[PDB]
Amino acid sequence: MSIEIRKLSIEDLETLIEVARESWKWTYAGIYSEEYIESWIREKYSKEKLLNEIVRSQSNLDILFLGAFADSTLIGFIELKIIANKAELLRLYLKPEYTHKKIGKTLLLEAEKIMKKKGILECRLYVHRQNSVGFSFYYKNGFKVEDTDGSDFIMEKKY
Amino acid sequence: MSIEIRKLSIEDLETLIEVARESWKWTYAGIYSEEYIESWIREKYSKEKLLNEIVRSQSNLDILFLGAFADSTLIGFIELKIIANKAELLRLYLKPEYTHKKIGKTLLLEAEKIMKKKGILECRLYVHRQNSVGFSFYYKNGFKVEDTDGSDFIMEKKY
């Protein structure tokens, strides 16, 4: 199992949406309803929005959008948003069958490496409080809860 | 997510084979080849063999064959073989998306409960040495390595 991390490109769009869908159905099985998720996928992970995000990342602006590829097949992705010297980890998702193999850790390290290249010293995120899979991974990797907003925990990491 | 543990019945056959297939492809992705697995599924998990095993379990003889059912859908199974006062854990497999939720632990506890009812004080198993997922679960649950046979570790638990 060879895993490559690289910036996503527009050709990654269609399988990106499928990874997102598959990871979302799994991750939130006890949190949101099947329809809530299908609408979320349709509205937030639309072809147009992701394309624009993939482009802003490729153009080296306010998005960093990396995928993990297993034998050329996209199986995970991370997306950060940069404003000034700070980042927000918007998204980190893998195909459920590819979890617990350090692939999430690998995407995070890559982003962190690029943030350090960019002078970004703070990174923060919003995680649904009932998402133990995600929440536990984050605190195991140096994120600390600093606040809440609705159902989410606001976690933050400094460098 | 409601999980029920009960003895398998002949009507469980077709979805039993699919769980086995899906768990096998995942579990041994870096261990055996796609064909080795498809042959193993075809030859060891055949309709006839499993049926006979399900029957011997239902008849209360030398097999104990339990499934874990999530909302009426079979998602995992355990199978033990009894000879005298001792057992061998032949099989324990879940759909990959259902792992890491204590469902494996739940099947093991059920079998252990029945073994104790039956006076069975020793339980042993063979785990492929490169199966870290399975091997780690077993030692986290009181199994200790006592020997090897080919690629497998022979692990054993006493009560």
Ligand SMILES: CC(=O)SCCNC(=O)CCNC(=O)[C@H](O)C(C)(C)COP(=O)(O)OP(=O)(O)OC[C@H]1O[C@@H](n2cnc3c(N)ncnc32)[C@H](O)[C@@H]1OP(=O)(O)O
């Ligand atoms: C800001 C946001 O994007 S929030 C949404 C975060 N993403 C999700 O929840 C989607 C579902 N999960 C995933 O995609 C992944 O598990 C990630 C990205 C959260 C973590 O990546 P992975 O490569 O799976 O994790 P990695 O192998 O580095 O670390 C393992 C740890 O993560 C957590 N974890 C990873 N996979 C699993 C799993 N299948 N079941 C339970 N916990 C898991 C555990 O805490 C585990 O620690 P343990 O060994 O003590 O049990």
Ligand SMILES: CC(=O)SCCNC(=O)CCNC(=O)[C@H](O)C(C)(C)COP(=O)(O)OP(=O)(O)OC[C@H]1O[C@@H](n2cnc3c(N)ncnc32)[C@H](O)[C@@H]1OP(=O)(O)O
């Ligand atoms: C004799 C034989 O049958 S050998 C074949 C054994 N079965 C397999 O390997 C098939 C693949 N795996 C599985 O079906 C299951 O993981 C089982 C049956 C081994 C364990 O059942 P689960 O309900 O998943 O495990 P449970 O939640 O009780 O325990 C979690 C522990 O099991 C292991 N584990 C369970 N799921 C995973 C996973 N997706 N990735 C990595 N490790 C895992 C870990 O050691 C975990 O401990 P951690 O929290 O420290 O990481």
Ligand SMILES: [Cl-]
């Ligand atoms: Cl979340």
Ligand SMILES: [Cl-]
């Ligand atoms: Cl094994």
Ligand code: NI
């Ligand atoms: Ni774990």
